[PDB]
Design a protein around this ligand. Structure first.
Ligand code: A1MA6
Ligand code: PCW
Ligand code: PCW
Ligand code: PCW
Ligand code: PCW
Ligand code: PCW
Ligand code: PCW
Ligand code: CLR
Ligand code: CLR
Ligand code: CLR
Ligand code: ADP
Ligand code: MG
Ligand code: NA
Ligand code: NA
Ligand code: NA
Ligand code: NA
Length: 979
């Protein structure tokens, strides 16, 4: 409740010139940037407690405790003790600590990449300083400068409106509004939230433009004080995540069951009540998989960084998953399929077609520049146009300089300045009284100006728009200079002119004008843009103007890739069916051979109504028909046609098309740029907002932001989206297989009563060696040459962890790695004197420190450490047999449909993994001192080879398993083993 003078007098500011740059910076440095402050958080404290002290590591923390107590009771009691317990503790503790560090290096990394994408797409406001308009980062606005807003932009700070032009804002988020409340410079209510002279932070200007003085800036804002609570914030979990958990749950159920069973088995065989619970605890711990979620989050984060490099920024991680399943792409034409770099090619007037483009000069012998009709046409183009040359281009040529405005008005303005002269004087020659702006629902632009004829003081009215609309507003024709009527002979010549200019892939516009009678509208009468002050019809059409706009380079290949993937492409444009059909013919939306109902009518020379609608695979639906249609008809066109093009369509229509596409049961992505798109951009599954030309509304409302506005960028993004899935399945498949060889020894040991084949140190060696680096390498895998040549996926029918993964890992591949390790075990014992038949039952006697007389097969007598040494030589051999079989499992994991001979060994990280593991096994087995500390003994050379036959069998099996897939689709193998 103040005035414009009191406001400018309190903060200090010129209503017509704004602040000065020096003063602006003085205030910018005086009170801090216009950005909210970060909220409270848990530091590394709660970050490390969850890592080193979580749920699975806790058990290891116990193993370490127990062992230390085992050493203390020893050194305090027994003279000259042993040290296997002290080094066991020193080894276990080091494992919990490392696992924690690795996980930390991963949790942070993701938290940081997401923060980077927030500054990729910042917000830049429009401020007026020293009398000039400039777009600066929202973080540089201060209190006092002048700020201008336009329908589609976001209010930067708390403004005090000083001048508005039918400006409306969306005040729903702060409070609870719905409809657009209009912002007027006058004051209306005592409550600041109800008055219209104040713009607010985080609000958006729906329609109109306005000016205002920044009253409040930075945290000193309404939503800033409210943010006390906001600080917390909220996030989410992708589908995949709630898929993994589910799995984990089932497995836990299977694991708990088996535990109780192993319990009854132990007691029916005479174990100690305590030994049965020790077994239940161990078995349930060995059946539940560990790591699944960390690898899912890391894989997604890494893929997003891959996508932002290829021009596709994702507002969240759920978008990374939805992009792959994409079935339909509803794309627009001017901006996506094209470049918006249009240029006038053919002009129509005096029933004649005229060419142009006088090579940045006055040559080309286009048309007499003297033509009267041409003077009228050149004048309306130069007058109704709203664009203007960017300041300071007095040096560059007429075609290469910079302009501000629609691409249509820019092509028009340049043609008129090259072969027609300076527009600023042409614009002052005639004074602009009242102007009405363009719109997609109107489809025309009009304005009235004074007439510079010093002998005629009348009023001139000019309007341009889609040639069809303008034709319906004319009853005369400016012909050869005079006027004539629009009868059918020239009406048909005009129709054949639309197809001549249209088939050329050119954009066409209509231009007409009329002399308002100064007797019914005097020089003093003001024609406010409210009611019918101008005769819409009875105008004088002067002539058409056509311009070319080419498609992007990569676009033809993109549509081809979509067709091979099993993806439908739809073009939604505001132009004419001819230009639509054409662009479609070029990009590839409408491939060769397919015809429409009109094409068949033309070939057969039969009425269009007689032709069968099912006979045509492709169709071009207009807008009037779409408005008149119900729902079953829409489903008919969407289901029966393969290539559907939509021409002449308002924005309020897009939603009907999207609802039709979802009714079928398909995932859709839509490309949007304005305000009327926000509704559509929310209902669809993937909202693609333009980065270059979009508005704050389109970006806030969508899931993704296209950085280059290229249709080609998208298809590449979907390729990146499918690869995530493929690699995730491969990695999980590689991780779950080692579970079988680690559990089978503890089973035969208890049931069959033989010496323990795998122990605690060796098992930890397997998990950390063959499951960490090789697994990570898999993420980096390339794409098989089938990724785009395969149908999309139905999330309901196809899941990540299904009953087939467990079939290949546990059942087929696993059991083989187990047999491979059992051979190296049997071989080591038989050679050292203990044969296989004699081994069943020796455990009871084997594990007794007191029987130094153990007798072997050849009849020799063994002490306690002499036989324990051979057992340890078996733990080490098992280990190596596992790395050897892992070689094979890893190679076969690279591809699931193609061979490795086809895919190739170009992955460097995977190789690194093979050589490094081999090195770890050779190093630990041969180093001089592991004996004392880790309990691994040297392996003789004839032993390393025991696992080789089992490693070749796995590779050959998977190779054939695949050949049969490639040859017989939908067969038994694909139904059963394709995960
Ligand atoms: C950290 C862990 C925890 C521990 C770790 C541990 O290892 C180590 O840290 C150590 O702790 C280190 C700690 C050291 C601490 C300190 C030390 O430093 C210091 C030194 O320690 C030394 C000790 C140390 O030297 C020791 O030796 C260490 C070992 O300890 C364990 C030993 O074995 C054993 O404990 C020895 C100790 C002693 O023996 C204990 C005895 C009992 C306590 C108790 O009985 C004695 C006594 O009686 O207790 C009394 C107290 C009472 O209140 C208690 C109340 C009793 C309740 C009764 C109810 C029972 C119950 C319960 C019901 C639920 C069900 C039910 C059926 O039974 C039901 C039925 C009722 C109706 C029964 C009623 C019975 C009544 C009984 C009671 O009344 C009492 O007995 C009674 O009151 C008594 O007083 C009385 O005397 C009674 O006597 C008799 C009773 C009978 O005896 C008794 O009842 C009997 C027999 C029952 C029998 O079951 C009956 C059967 C026959 C049956 O009925 C039968 O007939 N069947 C006939 C069938 C038949 O015909 N069939 C014919 C078929 C025809 O068709 C009599 O009968 C009764 O009448 C009479 O009343 O109710 C009281 O105090 C006294 O009385 C006392 O004497 C073993 C270990 O713990 C340890 O090694 C000390 O000597 C020394 O002085 C000290 O200085 C977690 C574990 C790990 O997770 C796991 O890995 C684990 O490590 C492995 C499993 C190890 C195994 O493998 C190792 C090698 C490698 C492994 O590590 C590998 O890692 C394995 C892994 C595992 C998994 C899988 C896989 O493999 C791998 C995969 C993982 C991979 O996947 C991953 C992915 N996620 C990635 C990767 O990791 O992980 C091996 O080395 C291990 O050896 C091996 O085990
Ligand atoms: C829980 C999941 C486990 C997964 C794999 C577990 C691997 C376990 C494999 C073996 C462990 C059992 C212990 C074997 C010891 C049995 C000894 C035996 O058997 O002594 C019989 C013969 C020895 O004859 P000799 O020459 O000394 O007699 C000479 C006679 N004179 C001279 C008088 C003419 O030994 C033979 O013939 C060959 C016997 C050698 C081993 C055969 C064991 C059974 C056969 C295949 C097992 C693999 C099954 C795979 C299943 C996949 C799904 C689970
Ligand atoms: C010290 C340790 C050394 C370890 C040595 C390991 C050796 C390897 C072990 C076994 C190898 C045999 C496995 C054969 C399995 C069948 C593979 C198969 O059927 O692949 C089919 C592919 C055809 O694909 P496509 O036409 O659909 O591609 C289309 C591409 N697009 C789309 C671009 C046109 O064929 C191809 O890629 C052509 C590739 C041909 C490769 C032939 C290899 C066989 C030669 C000897 C094998 C060893 C025999 C016994 C050895 C005992 C050794 C001591
Ligand atoms: C004694 C018996 C033992 C039996 C044990 C069995 C062990 C496991 C059995 C087999 C596993 C090894 C199989 C190796 C496969 C070689 C396949 C190959 O050669 O396919 C030729 C490729 C294709 O080329 P392209 O241009 O047509 O592809 C065009 C690709 N598109 C279309 C996408 C552009 O060419 C390329 O990949 C480029 C050249 C890559 C050369 C890779 C050489 C390294 C191979 C293995 C490394 C050793 C690891 C073990 C470490 C332990 C050592 C101590
Ligand atoms: C990637 C992760 C996968 C695997 C991770 C495994 C984590 C394990 C972490 C730590 C384990 C530490 C083990 C400590 C090594 C032994 C220390 C020790 O407690 O030794 C005690 C022995 C004394 O035995 P004694 O007197 O009873 O023997 C009597 C012999 N009689 C009587 C027959 C003559 O000491 C001796 O023998 C003297 C020999 C000293 C041995 C020097 C070897 C250096 C050890 C590690 C350095 C290697 C790092 C790798 C760098 C790679 C660079 C590219
Ligand atoms: C481009 C870069 C490629 C890199 C590939 C991987 C690099 C491989 C690196 C090293 C491998 C060579 C190992 C040579 C070691 C010989 C040392 C030796 O003196 O050893 C003697 C033993 C005989 O022991 P004994 O029990 O009779 O006497 C024991 C007598 N006492 C115990 C009383 C002393 O003999 C043995 O260990 C035999 C040793 C094994 C023989 C090698 C056979 C493999 C040959 C080629 C396969 C290479 C894979 C490439 C595949 C490419 C496919 C596209
Ligand atoms: C140390 C040893 C190292 C080497 C070991 C090598 C072991 C690997 C050997 C073979 C791999 C076994 C893969 C198992 C898959 C067989 C499944 C099968 O039965 O699938 C038959 C399919 C039928 O599909 P469908 O759609 O008509 O079914 C319609 C079904 N309904 C009517 C119900 C809808 O395909 C057909 O019938 C026609 C296709 C038949 C393909 C036969 C492939 C034989 C290839 C190699 C075997 C020879 C190895 C020689 C080595 C000598 C070693 C001593
Ligand atoms: C699920 C996990 C964490 C439970 C671990 C239980 C541990 C603490 C239990 C399992 C078996 C127990 C041992 C069983 C037998 C004996 C022998 C006795 O003369 C001293 C205690 C001692 C050595 C016990 C100490 C505690 C012990 C090691
Ligand atoms: C350690 C040993 C004894 C365990 C042996 C486990 C074997 C028998 C288990 C491991 C994985 C299991 C398979 C997992 C999935 C399926 C698919 C289902 O539609 C039919 C059963 C089938 C094919 C299972 C059969 C039994 C199976 C092969
Ligand atoms: C392609 C297929 C059929 C070939 C199978 C070859 C079999 C028979 C070969 C492959 C590796 C071989 C083993 C390699 C190493 C040793 C250690 C030695 O001290 C005793 C023999 C023994 C245990 C061999 C026995 C025969 C063996 C198992
Ligand atoms: N400034 C303008 N004034 C009048 N008509 C225009 C203007 N710009 C474009 N047109 C024409 O009006 C119609 C509506 O265009 P629009 O809704 O933007 O569709 P598109 O997205 O295909 O350009 C098109 O035929 C277009 O050629
Ligand atoms: Mg558009
Ligand atoms: Na693990
Ligand atoms: Na959405
Ligand atoms: Na594996
Ligand atoms: Na594992």
């Amino acid at each position: 409740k103040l005035s414009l003078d009191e406001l400018h007098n309190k903060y200090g500011t010129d209503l017509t010139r704004g602040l000065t740059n020096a003063r602006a910076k003085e205030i910018l440095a005086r009170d801090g940037p216009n950005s909210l402050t970060p909220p409270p958080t848990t530091p590394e404290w709660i970050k490390f407690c969850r890592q080193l002290f979580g749920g699975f590591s806790i058990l290891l923390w116990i193993g370490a405790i127990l062992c230390f107590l085992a050493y203390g009771i020893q050194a305090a009691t027994e003279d000259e003790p042993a040290n296997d317990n002290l080094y066991l503790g020193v080894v276990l503790s080091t494992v919990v600590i490392v696992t924690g560090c690795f996980s930390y290096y991963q949790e942070a990394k993701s938290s940081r990449i997401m923060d980077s994408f927030k500054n990729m797409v910042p917000q830049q406001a429009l401020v007026i300083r020293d009398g000039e308009k400039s777009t600066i980062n929202a973080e540089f606005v201060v209190a006092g400068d002048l700020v201008e807003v336009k329908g589609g932009d976001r209010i930067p700070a708390d403004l005090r409106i000083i001048s508005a032009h039918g400006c409306k804002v969306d005040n729903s988020s702060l409070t609870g509004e719905s409809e657009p409340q209009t912002r007027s410079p006058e004051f209306s209510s005592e409550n600041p939230l109800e008055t219209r002279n104040i713009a607010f932070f985080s609000t958006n200007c729906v329609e109109g433009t306005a000016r205002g003085v920044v009253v409040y800036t930075g945290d000193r804002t309404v939503m800033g004080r409210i943010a006390t609570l906001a600080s917390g914030l909220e996030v989410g979990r992708t589908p995949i995540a709630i898929e993994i958990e589910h799995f984990i749950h089932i497995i836990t159920g299977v694991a708990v069951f088996l535990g109780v069973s192993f319990f009854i088995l132990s007691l029916i065989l005479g174990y100690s009540w305590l030994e049965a619970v020790i077994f239940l605890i161990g078995i349930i711990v060995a059946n539940v998989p560990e790591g699944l979620l960390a690898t899912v989050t890391v894989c997604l984060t890494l893929t997003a960084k891959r996508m932002a490099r290829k021009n596709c920024l994702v507002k969240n991680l759920e978008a990374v998953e939805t992009l792959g399943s994409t079935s339909t792409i509803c794309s627009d034409k001017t901006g996506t399929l094209t470049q918006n770099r249009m240029t006038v090619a053919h002009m129509w007037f005096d029933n004649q077609i005229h060419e142009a483009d006088t090579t940045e000069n006055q040559s080309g012998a286009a048309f007499d520049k003297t033509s009267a009709t041409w003077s009228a046409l050149s004048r309306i183009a130069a007058l109704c146009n709203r664009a203007v040359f960017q300041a300071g281009q007095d040096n560059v040529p007429i075609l290469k300089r910079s302009v501000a405005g629609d691409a249509s008005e820019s092509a028009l303005l340049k043609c008129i300045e090259l072969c027609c002269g300076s527009v600023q004087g042409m614009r002052d020659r005639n004074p602009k009284i009242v102007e009405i702006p363009f719109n997609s629902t109107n489809k025309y632009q009009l304005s009235i100006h004074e007439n510079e004829k010093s002998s005629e003081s009348r009023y001139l009215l000019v309007m341009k728009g889609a040639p069809e609309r303008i034709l319906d507003r004319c009853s005369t024709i400016l012909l050869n200079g005079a006027e004539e009527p629009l009868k059918e002979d020239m009406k048909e010549a005009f129709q054949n002119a639309y197809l001549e200019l249209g088939g050329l892939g050119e954009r066409v516009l209509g231009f007409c004008h009329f002399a308002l009678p100064e007797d019914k509208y005097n020089e003093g009468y003001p024609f406010d843009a409210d009611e019918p002050n101008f005769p819409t019809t009875d105008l004088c059409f002067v002539g058409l103007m056509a311009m070319i706009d080419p498609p992007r380079a990569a676009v033809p290949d993109a549509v081809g890739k979509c067709r091979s993937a099993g993806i439908k492409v739809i073009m939604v444009t505001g132009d004419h069916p001819i230009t639509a059909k054409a662009i479609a013919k070029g990009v590839g939306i409408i491939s060769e051979g397919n015809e429409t109902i009109e094409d068949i009518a033309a070939r057969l020379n039969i009425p269009i109504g007689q032709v069968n609608p099912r006979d045509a695979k492709a169709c071009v639906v207009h807008g009037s028909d779409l408005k008149d249609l119900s729902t079953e008809v829409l489903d008919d066109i969407l289901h029966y046609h393969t290539e559907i093009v939509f021409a002449r369509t308002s924005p309020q229509q897009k939603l009907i098309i999207v609802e039709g596409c979802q009714r079928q049961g398909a995932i859709v992505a839509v490309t949007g740029d304005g305000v009327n798109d926000s509704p559509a951009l929310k209902k669809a599954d993937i909202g693609v907002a333009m980065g270059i030309s979009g508005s704050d509304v389109s970006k806030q409302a969508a899931d993704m932001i296209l950085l280059d506005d290229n249709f080609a960028s998208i298809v590449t993004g979907v390729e990146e989206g499918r690869l995530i899935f493929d690699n995730l399945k491969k990695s999980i498949a590689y991780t779950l297989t080692s579970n079988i060889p680690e559990i089978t020894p503890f089973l035969v040991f208890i049931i069959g009563n033989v010496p323990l084949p795998l122990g605690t140190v060796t098992i930890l060696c397997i998990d950390l060696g063959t499951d960490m680096v090789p697994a990570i390498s898999l993420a980096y895998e390339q794409a098989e040459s089938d990724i785009m040549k395969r149908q999309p996926r139905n999330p309901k029918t196809d899941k990540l962890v299904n009953e087939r993964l467990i079939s290949m890992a546990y059942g087929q591949i696993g059991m083989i790695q187990a047999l491979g390790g059992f051979f190296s075990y049997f071989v080591i014992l038989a050679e050292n004197g203990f044969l296989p038949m004699d081994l069943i039952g020796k455990r009871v006697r084997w594990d007794d420190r007191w029987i130094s007389d153990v007798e072997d097969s050849f009849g020799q007598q063994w002490t306690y450490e002499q036989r324990k040494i051979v057992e340890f030589t078996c733990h080490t051999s098992f280990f190596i047999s596992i790395v050897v079989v892992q070689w094979a499992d890893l190679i076969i994991c690279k591809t699931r449909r193609n061979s490795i001979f086809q895919q190739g060994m170009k992955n460097k990280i995977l190789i690194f993994g093979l050589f490094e593991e081999t090195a770890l096994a050779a190093f630990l087995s041969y180093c001089p001192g592991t004996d004392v500390a880790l309990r691994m003994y040297p392996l003789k050379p004839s032993w390393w080879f025991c696992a080789f036959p089992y490693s070749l069998i796995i590779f050959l099996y998977d190779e054939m398993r695949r050949f049969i897939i490639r040859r017989s689709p939908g067969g038994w193998v694909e139904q059963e083993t394709y995960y």
